[PDB]
Design a protein around this ligand. Structure first.
Ligand SMILES: [Ca+2]
Ligand SMILES: [Ca+2]
Ligand SMILES: [Ca+2]
Ligand SMILES: [Ca+2]
Ligand SMILES: [Ca+2]
Ligand SMILES: [Ca+2]
Ligand SMILES: [Ca+2]
Lengths: 144, 352, 352, 144, 352, 352, 144, 144
């Protein structure tokens, strides 16, 4: 795992920039604004709380490694994504309309951009039927 | 196709009053068949009930055979059951397996028994197996199983300690009553098996009375064992009943179903953004509009946002609790402090 | 004017000590009548009790008829029972129906049977029926029914699974004990009806002892069934008891009756303003002082205000919960943020 | 109900005035002030919360249609109005004094104007005896 | 001065291990006397136990007579029991009455019986009554009574409905089994009294088996009644057990005893200030430093402050709840808003 | 180095599936031995089971003797069990004592009894005792004991009142039924011991039926006693079941294990700083950067900080409650007020 | 009770001054400061809450009458005062030392003046024993 | 003894410097800053709350005596320290690595100085094995 530890350390150093060994809310927000996201202080605190295990308010390298060591291909993650998709499933038959999916994606939550919403619809297209199947969507999302 | 979905909702997920009436009528006809099965064992009613059994079983086997086929065809409305493999995935459910077994054994009985003790025992057991047909969704079984699994440590503890008490008290009463002879000259406790039978009957508070200790030592041991170890066998009912009541009470503090719509949309969006970050030529990279080393940072920030979205979706599906109050106060206090810091910074910048 | 209300509060909704004494005396004399009816079935006490029964029943039928007439007249104090249709609305209630039936059948019995087995069977059943007269308001029945309805899914689950276990275990024990003969030469399990009777008696933990399995297979099946399926029949008592305790505990965190006065007044006012908006020439239109298109907006704002008032009245009638804390914090945080924003706006306006 | 949808869309456009497709607290308060109500921010948030289903903080046209599709003639609404009236019923006989009703209406809650309170009393007049029957009042109010 | 209090704490409110050992020894000697009473009824042990009973009863009557006098003298440490009327107030308590009865009847029995059936029945009942001596403070009785009183409506409802079910089912089974004759030629249900005895034994899940329905109608009625009405008699145990558990859980969220010291001091001070306002020449009037008409206003403000102090003392003695959170947030929000208004007013005065 | 830890985790604190399979196999073989012990008492199976018992007991005594030695060696992985005294400290545990007894008595039996009735009774009791070997950590016993200790006052109250009721009702029924003779000419209530046996069997809802009151007075007393005093014996099961359910519900509001890391570190640091303050030449005195009289103040401030750290560690290990909300609001309100005071002070200093 | 209503109305008018018919926190605090007590806003709100029943935030004449119609000689009030006294009862024998009572009265709660504390001790003096009986104190306090 | 009372009174006078007889948050913070610790207001309130029994917000001499009369050699205190040490015990065998102990001590909680952390490690050194036994550490910590 030489390459994995090397790239994780490089990513950690791209956030730290101080040599302290801990990533704080200020540093995370600084990098996010460098990317151009002007995140809220509450958002940054929520981002920090997940990675931070000890509870001191920062992120150490063991915490960074633990958070990078997770996987979205997990069965629980797949079930969670399916359950999130079932909120917009009206009939309950495992199908969601393309128009309703596009509206929800563009107008709720993170408010995805139109181009990436069309990219998702292209990926989640059952031969262009118009009533997309959201099970194969989660299948290829978690396939990685 | 909407007719397939309509008949599926009629059959597997009934809602309304017509579906309830249909299912209730099916339950009544099955119960009448069971009552006829009971009456077939009685001597005077043996011939009449059995004569009525043949046509009733023919009618029921035809009706259930037609309804099974209709249901299996209608299963294609869902997405998991589309196609041949979807149909045989439907057939692997326990309730569908029971439905197929009941029908196939009914036809086998009608084709073999018609050409003894077994030829009627089989059909009697088959009309007992038909009472499982009432619960199509398995709701009662799932409701029992969740509460049983949650309190599994307590249930195991009570069962283990009660079993230990039963074994030891049965042995001691057997030792006390090994040679005793009651009225009519019969040794009630002739072996440890007899002592164990007495112990089970006593500890379950049934008390048939066919075995009662007759010596003073045995009566004293039985008195102490009855006083103490009976509660260990009455405990599981209390544990499960209190659990059921606690879940019912918790049902009144559930958040509205519309409160998780933004959280679910955010979870889907964050998961898909994490997925699409894996494509170097994706169109999700223009949100940050040259970009060479920012990819490693973006793929980490997106993962963190995905984890936050997972937490929010988890919290949105739970009933209200003290954790919600604590989190709300934390966010509000942080926002108020940030606003007052902004006030201070503005004042110092403007006036110095 | 107030005499009708006073006698209605005396009879239908007793409160104080005089009404309690009256109702307790009625309960005592009814219980004495029931005890005399019980004694009438004994050989030695048959003549004395029956001889005493006639005058006591005449006195009771006259007293209860007079009290029924007084109560029906006094029912007009309320507004639902004013007039002829109100009187026949009062008479339609189940308790009034029972009161009328008990009196009319009492007169019929005393006028026909007096001048054999049925003539005393009916009177015994009628004085058994007089114990329902104690609960004038139906409070006990409503209290039981609310908790039963709330826990209906759990009750149905437990009953269904216990019934399934009873049926299957009874069948298996019948198969194990079909041919067994006990002492004194009697086949206890001669049919599935006998097996079902044994199963009910065993699973309800009564255990009369008239039917006990006598083979080792039957004893093992009975042991497992008694250990497990007995809890499924003891569960409803635990569920209902825990529910009752939970409601009693929730009664200690109820909001004061005076906290819903503003909410009720606001609900009435908003509902009437929504109603009066439907009149083009109403005097509710001068609150906003040519009005042509503002009316369509006002009729929507009023509906929204009515919905808010409904929410507030619903919340005012509930006990304290975490939702109250969350809503209070939300409102307070919003007000504080608005105030600090006003501070910022004033400072920027004044000093720039 | 095409005409009903047309009038509902007209009302929604009157509330919106922006063409965005959503109604916010700012727009609702702007219209309310245009009518002369100067409502509080908490009041505006409470008004928005009932209509807003999805939880995004605004009102879309489906939410507006759902809110306009409700009814006050409902049996539950009638029972709720009766229960509200019972709070001021001293005895429990279904009658409330005209003077007490007038005092409550003018001095509590929304603080109805004297003229509309007299209008209500005229509508709920049991031959001028002075002890109004509040069940007939709910009967006529819910009759619409 | 402190010897009386020390012996009172030794006797009536034991604490430590020496007092516990003393009370345990007393309990053991009383239990040994009860066991000797039990053994006196047995034929072989009748003579020896009765011979031993005389000396044991003499020793116990002397010991309890001395200890009663010591306790009655030591009761003067308290303030309610000082003096002659205080001593007769102590003697009036139920436990002291029982202690006096057990001693006086013991001396009477030992002086009359020693110098037949009644002479032994009385002393047996007297040593049965000595078990009440264990609970000196009545803690168990008060703990049971509080929970019973709190759940009184539920207990009354369950008892009433169970009694109605028992009465009706007993009557129906009596009608079904009036003429039936079992094996050995004995009519088990010969009267409604016999039916009621069967109903009590069945509904309490005892099931002796001396009376069992033998017809199919009676068995069906008994099956339904046993399935349903048994839970109505098992309910009170569940209600009371869940109540006990809920109080025990509430004991873990009790406020510290020191949180009510300021509240109690404030209540005493406010009550005494309200009392002293009644004196025109009191020295409590110089707090407001002539004074002619301010008295009417002061006596109202003091009453309002007294009511507030009563509320605060009531709240300080309760466990934590949602009401505490709501009140705390209300006070904090009010203080914060007042502070921001002070900020605004200061800034406007200084620069505006 | 780590092999000792791996085998200790395999034996004493199993986790995974291999250890579970091993322990399950041990449980099954012990249960088979118990079943063979039961079969040894029966006449036909006496020879075969006893003949098979010898080899099975030899195999089990060798296996358990080897495993006890392996476990005792492996105990050195922990720190409390290092060395000779650590090993004999391990041997003093009740479970290890039982394990040693079961093996040593097995070898003693195989070496003495093999080379009688006792020689089989002892081994039967020993392989009854082997069922305690399943619970290595005593988790079930501790889980029962904690809940029993928490509800000890309620359990004692119910037991005491039920015992009093049993004693008094038994005496009254004995008086009512002293001279009665049932069918077949046998006095069921011949003494107060017989009355007590009847009372225990009735109040525990067993009801064997060997003693039933036969007079109307006895039946009435038995009816009242059965209706009332039975709930006092069914109460402990309800109390303990509701307690178990309440703990299980409280398990869902527990704080994460990582939340107490800062609190534990702070407690250790504060305790060690209090300890090191006792050294005049310690290096903990340079935290304040001579120092002669400040030592008395520092040693008090450090003790106060240690007490605060103890409180924080206690609070970090508890589930969420209203106290957490109250403390959080208090701290947040204090911080906000301090910030607004800083705003006011800055404004007044800058502008006046 | 014409005289009782008379002086109650006089006291209500003295508290009101505005003539509106209600007493607010501002008016109550104004009168209290006229007496010289500068009460806190939280204290004034707590004072208003007890008297105010309807919940509108003020005190009407019926509320004033209800509050003035109470009594301190009630058995519950006597038991409450006894329970408050038992907090400072160490032994539990119904006696509290004069020095401890004086310290508590002067240093806790309302912080009674020394002169009125000596007045109370003179009233609650069982022949100058020095260990005052707090039961006769409550007895004569409730005698009024 | 009289010596203990005299030294406790001397410490109380050093904390008070006012002769009032009570120690407030302001006085405690003043002394702490005189030592050079700049404590937070929340920290000072937490420090006061433990010692303050009556609840008036200050510390009287009886409260000071009660707080100084405690001891860390208590069995419950020893069990609490052991439970705190078990949080950082990974295996559960009663041993904690020296490096992990040093890191936790320097980087969590009160953030002990390096010199005192080395002093602790010297005290808690089982012949320099490197895997310190934290049971003997608590044993000698609670010895005095
Ligand atoms: Ca920083
Ligand atoms: Ca960290
Ligand atoms: Ca808009
Ligand atoms: Ca939208
Ligand atoms: Ca009025
Ligand atoms: Ca003004
Ligand atoms: Ca103080």
């Amino acid at each position: 795992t030489e390459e994995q530890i090397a790239e994780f350390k490089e990513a950690f150093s791209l956030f730290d920039k101080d040599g302290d060994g801990t990533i704080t809310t200020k540093e995370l927000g600084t990098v996010m604004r460098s990317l151009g996201q002007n995140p809220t202080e509450a958002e940054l605190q929520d981002m920090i709380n997940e990675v931070d295990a000890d509870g001191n308010g920062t992120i150490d390298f063991p915490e960074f490694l633990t958070m990078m060591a997770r996987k979205m291909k997990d069965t629980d993650s797949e079930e969670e994504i399916r359950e999130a998709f079932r909120v917009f499933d009206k009939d309950g038959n495992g199908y969601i309309s393309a128009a309703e999916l596009r509206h929800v994606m563009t107008n709720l939550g993170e408010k995805l951009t139109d181009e990436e919403v069309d990219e998702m619809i292209r990926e989640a297209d059952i031969d262009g039927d118009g009533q997309v199947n959201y099970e194969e969507f989660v299948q290829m999302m978690t396939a990685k | 196709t909407h007719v397939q979905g309509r008949v599926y909702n009629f059959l597997e997920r009934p809602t309304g009053w017509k579906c309830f009436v249909y299912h209730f009528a099916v339950f009544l006809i099955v119960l009448v068949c069971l009552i006829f099965s009971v009456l077939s064992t009685i001597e005077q009613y043996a011939a009449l009930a059995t004569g009525t059994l043949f046509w009733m079983e023919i009618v029921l086997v035809v009706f259930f055979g037609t309804e099974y086929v209709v249901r299996l065809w209608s299963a294609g409305c869902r997405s998991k059951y589309v196609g041949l493999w979807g149909r045989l995935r439907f057939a692997r459910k326990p309730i569908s397996i029971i439905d197929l077994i009941v029908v196939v054994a009914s036809m086998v009985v009608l084709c073999v028994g018609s050409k003894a003790t077994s030829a009627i025992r089989g059909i009697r057991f088959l009309q007992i197996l038909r009472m499982l047909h009432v619960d199509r969704q398995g709701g009662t079984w799932r409701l029992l199983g969740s509460v049983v699994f949650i309190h599994r440590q307590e249930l195991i503890t009570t069962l283990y300690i009660g079993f230990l008490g039963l074994i030891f008290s049965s042995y001691f009463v057997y030792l006390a009553e090994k040679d005793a002879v009651n009225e009519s000259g019969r040794v009630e406790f002739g072996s440890y098996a007899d002592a164990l039978w007495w112990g089970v009957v006593t500890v379950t508070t049934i008390g048939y009375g066919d075995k009662v200790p007759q010596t003073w030592v045995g009566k004293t041991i039985a008195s102490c064992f009855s006083v103490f170890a009976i509660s260990f066998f009455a405990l599981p009912a209390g544990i499960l009943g209190s659990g059921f009541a606690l879940k019912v009470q918790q049902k009144q503090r559930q958040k509205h179903f519309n409160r998780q719509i933004p959280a679910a949309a955010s979870l889907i969006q964050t998961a898909w953004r994490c997925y699409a970050a894996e494509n170097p030529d994706s169109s999700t990279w223009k949100i940050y509009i040259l970009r060479e080393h920012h990819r490693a940072t973006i793929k980490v920030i997106r993962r963190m946002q995905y984890f936050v979205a997972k937490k929010k979706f988890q919290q949105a599906r739970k009933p209200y609790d003290v954790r919600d109050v604590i989190e709300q106060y934390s966010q509000g206090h942080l926002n108020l402090m940030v606003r007052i810091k902004e006030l201070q910074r503005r004042l110092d910048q403007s006036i110095g």
